[PDB]
């Protein structure tokens, strides 16, 4: 199987209220394992998964150091962005950065990520070749030139193939029971009259992991999109995920509709019907 490790950094300036707030969260696949928040009462990297809580003091001291350094870099970048875009220090601004690696089944790097947005819009991203950057605007082109000048892509690649993969492997081993296990959804179909002539069929998938899932409706075996509603996959709050998909149907035609569910945890795809 393929796995991923990703970090998500968010920095938000707040003029008149001191330094920008920095938040970092780390994920292995769809499981959060660490958090750092500069507004925490005692800012430090904190465990959010049992399979990392066990790491010795070295790990927490070093992760805390790196999180703080990342926050510093983000503050510097916020200042720089004020320069690039000719913006006032009195306005609030946001930087978002995601980066990480995909470990392939063969054990080598499958894919790398390093991308950032400024005020909610693409700023700069590492291309598929892992060697070049896409700059979203003229401002980001300054950054592109700087990074070409200081071999940033190469050094990041060194991280991808180095510590990123090594730690991903390590976490996968230390928490195999929970990380390498795919929990299938518990599914069912409910029926909710809309009027005396129409009704809603809702197909539920609960308690599943990982988050990836497919949920569709068919009529007489044909794919249905008209009059359907699929909600965003949502967290259960316990490390699992949920989703439902509904379709409005003419009363009396319910038994021609089937819900189809695909998930890694299922031996076979599901074909479900309203079971009154």
């Amino acid at each position: 199987g393929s796995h991923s490790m990703k970090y998500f950094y968010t920095s938000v300036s707040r003029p008149g209220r001191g330094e920008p707030r920095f938040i970092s969260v780390g994920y292995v696949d769809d499981t959060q394992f660490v958090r750092f928040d500069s507004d925490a009462e005692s800012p430090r990297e904190e465990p959010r998964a049992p399979w990392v809580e066990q790491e010795g003091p070295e790990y927490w001291e070093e992760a805390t150091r790196r999180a703080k350094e990342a926050a510093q870099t983000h503050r510097e970048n916020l200042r720089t962005a004020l320069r690039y875009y000719n913006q006032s220090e009195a306005g609030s601004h946001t930087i978002q950065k995601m980066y990480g690696c995909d470990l392939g089944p063969d054990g080598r790097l499958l894919r790398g990520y390093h991308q950032s947005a400024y005020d909610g819009k693409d700023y700069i991203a590492l291309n598929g070749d892992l060697r070049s950057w896409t700059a979203a605007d003229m401002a980001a082109q300054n950054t592109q030139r700087k990074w070409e000048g200081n071999r940033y892509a190469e050094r990041f690649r060194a991280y991808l193939e180095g510590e990123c993969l090594e730690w991903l492997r390590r976490y996968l081993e230390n928490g195999k029971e929970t990380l390498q296990r795919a929990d299938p959804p518990k599914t069912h179909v409910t029926h909710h009259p809309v009027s005396d002539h129409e009704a809603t069929l809702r197909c539920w998938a609960l308690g599943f992991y990982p988050a990836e899932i497919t949920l569709t409706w068919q009529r007489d075996g044909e794919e249905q999109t008209q009059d359907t509603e699929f909600v965003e996959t949502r967290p259960g709050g316990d490390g699992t995920f949920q989703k439902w998909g509904a379709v409005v149907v003419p009363s009396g035609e319910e038994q021609r509709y089937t819900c189809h569910v695909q998930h890694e945890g299922l031996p076979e795809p599901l074909t479900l019907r309203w079971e009154p």
């Binding site: 990297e45 790990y59 990342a70 970048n77 390093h114 700023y123 950054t143 510590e163 990123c164």
Partner: peptide, 10 residues
């Protein structure tokens, strides 16, 4: 650690 050591300044 897993945290990126290299710092990318804009």
């Amino acid at each position: 650690g897993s945290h990126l050591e290299v710092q990318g300044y804009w």
